[PDB]
């Protein structure tokens, strides 16, 4: 239920944590280079996500915009963020176990390591330079590397009908980051941890 969010990047990021219809803990917070933010996530949180946001500007009330991962213009995120967003995904206390993964299904913006701080399982990582190697048609002018579903809005890329295969675009993400989901029906890279494990999300783990 504790997630330590550490920014090893050389640039500032604004962390965000949500399960889609509500914030987790405060939902969001600035993290300058090297800073750590420990949040509490309620047990049994299903479909929670943590991500980084880049190039944000927020007013005194906490309203503004980010070039990647913006969540309705709020500093304290109440909903998921606009792609591209490397995603740390987690569902806790599901019939006795935690389940974690990293997903590039909504694009890539910041490299990420997602690891337990307690025993019983391994971590996952996507720390390759996906933005620098991004295919031209996936490059997001605002920053990051978009997934093909946000770029092209096709049943095949978005897996709308629950039937879809890998694509030239999903194989790029999978080549650079095998341990992260590259498309909806990707062979699962989910890691089963003991129920009520604790975690650490490190941006730019290097």
Swiss-Prot record:
Upper classification of the source organism reads: Eukaryota, Viridiplantae, Streptophyta, Embryophyta, Tracheophyta
What this protein is reported to do is described as:
Taste-modifying protein; intensely sweet-tasting. It is 100000 times sweeter than sucrose on a molar basis.
Name this polypeptide is given: Thaumatin I
Asked if the Swiss-Prot or TrEMBL record annotates the protein with the keyword Disulfide bond, the reply is yes
Chief place where the protein resides = cytoplasm
Give the matching InterPro entries: Osmotin/thaumatin-like_sf, Thaumatin, Thaumatin_CS
Subcellular location per UniProt equals:
Cytoplasmic vesicle
Q: Cite a GO CC annotation.
A: cytoplasmic vesicle
**Family, as annotated:** Belongs to the thaumatin family.
Q: Which domain of life is it from?
A: Eukaryota
* Keywords assigned: Cytoplasmic vesicle, Disulfide bond, Signal, Taste-modifying protein
Which cysteine-cysteine pairs are annotated as disulfide bonds in the entry?
9-204, 56-66, 71-77, 121-193, 126-177, 134-145, 149-158, 159-164
**Which SMART domains would you find in this protein's record?**
THN
**Disulfide bond keyword on record:** yes
- One Pfam match, given by its short name, reads Thaumatin
Q: Which Gene3D superfamilies match?
A: Thaumatin
CDD domains, per database record:
TLP-P (cd09217)
Organism in which the protein naturally occurs: Thaumatococcus daniellii
